[PDB]
Paper text:
Key to these Nup98 activities is its large FG-repeat domain with a high number of FG motifs.
To gain insight into the molecular organization of cohesive FG-repeat interactions, Nup98FG85 was allowed to aggregate in pure water. The most abundant polymorph fibril, pm1, was resolved at a resolution of 2.8 Å and is formed by three asymmetrically arranged protofilaments. The structure of the most abundant polymorph, pm1, deviates considerably from the flat two-dimensional (2D) arrangement of cross-β-structure sheets. This leads to one chain forming contacts with several layers of the opposing protofilaments and the formation of a cluster of phenylalanine side chains (bottom). For example, the aromatic ring of F102 contacts three other phenylalanine rings located up to three layers away. The pm1 structure contains a large cavity that is predominantly lined by polar residues. We obtained values of approximately −20 kcal mol–1 per chain for the four Nup98FG85 fibril structures.
Numbering used by the authors:
A (entry chain P), B (entry chain M), C (entry chain J), D (entry chain G), E (entry chain D), F (entry chain A), ...: 85 to 124
K (entry chain C), L (entry chain F), M (entry chain I), N (entry chain L), O (entry chain O), P (entry chain R), ...: 88 to 121
U (entry chain B), V (entry chain E), W (entry chain H), X (entry chain K), Y (entry chain N), Z (entry chain Q), ...: 86 to 121
The structure:
């Protein structure tokens, strides 16, 4: 809820739910998430 | 909910749900998400 | 919900659901998402 | 819901659902999404 | 829902569902989406 | 739903469903979407 | 809730729920999350 | 709740729930989280 | 609740719940968390 | 609650609940936490 | 006296977008001079 | 006296977006001169 | 006297986004001169 | 005298986002001159 | 005299985000000159 | 005289985030000149 | 005279985050000149 | 004269975080010149 | 004269964090010149 | 004259953390010049 | 040399003494004054 | 040399003595004054 | 040499004596003054 | 040499005597003064 | 040599005598003064 | 040699006599003064 | 040699006589003075 | 040799005569004075 | 040789005659004075 | 030889004649004086 202010970069204030960030020089099959089976 | 303000970059205030970001120099089959089977 | 304001860049306030961003120098078969089977 | 205002760039306030962005220098078969089978 | 205003660029407020953007220097068979089989 | 106003660029407020944008310097067979078989 | 302000970098104030970040020089099958089966 | 301010780096004030960060020079199958089965 | 201010580094004031950080030179199957079965 | 200020490093004032940090030169299956079964 | 009764209900919306703009007294004047 | 009764209900929205903008007295004047 | 009765209820929203903006007296003047 | 009665209730929201902005008297003037 | 009655209740929110911004008298002037 | 009655209650929130910002008289002026 | 009545109650919050910011008279001026 | 009545109660919070910031008269001026 | 009545009570908090910041007259000026 | 009535009570806190910061007149000036 | 855009502006000739004032709000922006 | 963008601006000719003032709010921004 | 962007600006010609003033709020930003 | 970005700015020509003033608030930022 | 970014700025030409003043608030920031 | 970033800035050409003043608040920051 | 970052800055060319003044508050920070 | 970071700065070229003044508060920090 | 960090700075080129003044408060910190 | 950190700084090139002054408060810290 508080004010974010950078000068050169990223100012974030939001809520990030479920964020995957796999990051390398070399990767083999990087997956973010799996399958989503939703019922109602 | 708070104010974001950069000068050179990214000011974000929104809510990011389910964000995958796999990033390398070399990748092999990077997937974000899987299958989505939704029923109602 | 809060105000975003950059000068040179990206000011975002919206909600991003399900965002995949796989990004490299070299990729092989990068997929964002899978199959979408939806029934009602 | 909050005001976005850049000067040079992207001000976004909308909600982005299901956005794939695979981006490299060299890619081989980058797919955004899969198949969409929808029934009602 | 909030006001977007850039000066040089993109002000967006709409909701973007299902947006693929695969973009490189060199690509081989980049597909956005797959097949769409819809029944009712 | 909120007002978009750029000066030089793109102000968008509409909802974009299913938008593929594969764009490179060199491409080979870039397809937007697949086949559309719809029955009723 | 308090104000964040960097000059060169990342000022964050938002709440991040469920954030995986596996990052190396070389990885083999890095997954962020698993499967999501949700019912209501 | 208190003000964070770096000059070159990361000023954070938000609450981070459930953050996994496994990071090496070489990894083999690093997973952030497991499966999510949620019912209501 | 108190003010954090570095010059080169990380100033944090937020509350971090449930943060795993397993990090080596070489790892084999580092997991952050396990499975999440939640009911209501 | 008191002010933290480094010059090169980490100034922290927040409360960290449940933080695992297993870190070596070589590890084999380092897990942060176990399974989370929550009911209400 | 002018009245507007407006409703816009959707039921079971999947992968959809609904924008509802209930504006009351929204004038737009481009050039107001004097 | 002008009144607006506005409602926008959705039921069982999956993977969806709903934007509801209830504005009252929202004028927009581009050039106000004098 | 102008009144706005606004409601926007959703029930059982999965993976969704709801934005509700209840603005009252939101003018926007680009160029105010004199 | 203008009044706004605004409510935005959700029930059983899973993996969702709700933004509720109740603004009262929010003007925006770009160029105020004199 | 303008009044705003605002409420935003959620019940049983799992893995969700709720942002509630109750602002009263929030003007924004970009260029104030003289 | 302008009044704002604001409430934002959640009941049984699991793994969730609630941000409640009750601001009163929050102006923002970018360039104040003279 | 402007008044704000603000409340944000949660009941039975598990693994959750609640941020409540009750600000009164919070102006922000970027460039104050003269 | 402006008043703010603010309360933020939680009951039975497990593994949770509550931040409550009751600020009164918190201005922020970036560049004050003259 | 501006007043702030602030309370933040929790009952039965397990494994939790509560931060309560009751600030009164907290200005922040980045560049004060002259 | 501005007054702040602040209270933050917890009852039966297990394995918890409570931080209560009651500051009065806490200004922060980064660059004071002249 | 040559300049290729697909969208946007491709410009080849050199550009000298160019003023531009970009804001959301400007009071008396000038590029140039008087010559001689 | 050559300049290739797909979107945006590709510029090849050199650029000398260029002023630009970028803000959200400016009081009397000038690029240049008087010549002789 | 050559410059390739996909989005953004690709620029090949050299750039000399360039002023830019970037802020949220500026009082009398100048790039350059007077010549002779 | 060559410069490749996908997003952002790729620049090949050399850059000499460049001023930039970056802030949230500036009172009279100048890049350069007077020549001769 | 060559410079490759995916996002951000890739720059190949050398950079000499460059001033930049970065703050949240600046009173009269100058890059350069007068030449001769 | 070569410089590869994925995000951020990749720079190959050498950099000489560069000034930068980084603060939250600066009174008259100068990079350089006068030449001759 | 070569420089590889994933995020941040990869720099290959050598850097000589570089000044930087980093603070939260500075009164008249200078990098360099006068040349000749 | 070669320099690999994942986050942060990878730098290969040598660095000579570099000044940096790091504080929370500085009165007249100088890197360098006058040349000749 | 080679330098590998995951986070932070990996530096390969040698560093000679480098000054740095680190404090919370400094009155006139200098790296270097005058050359000739 | 080679230098491996996971977090922090890995440095391979040799370092010669380096000054650093570390305090909470310094009055006129100098690294170096005058050359010739």
């Amino acid at each position: 809820t508080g004010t974010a202010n950078t000068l050169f970069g990223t100012a974030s204030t939001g809520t990030s739910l479920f964020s995957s960030q796999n990051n390398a020089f070399a990767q083999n099959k990087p997956t973010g998430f799996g399958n989503f089976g939703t019922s109602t």
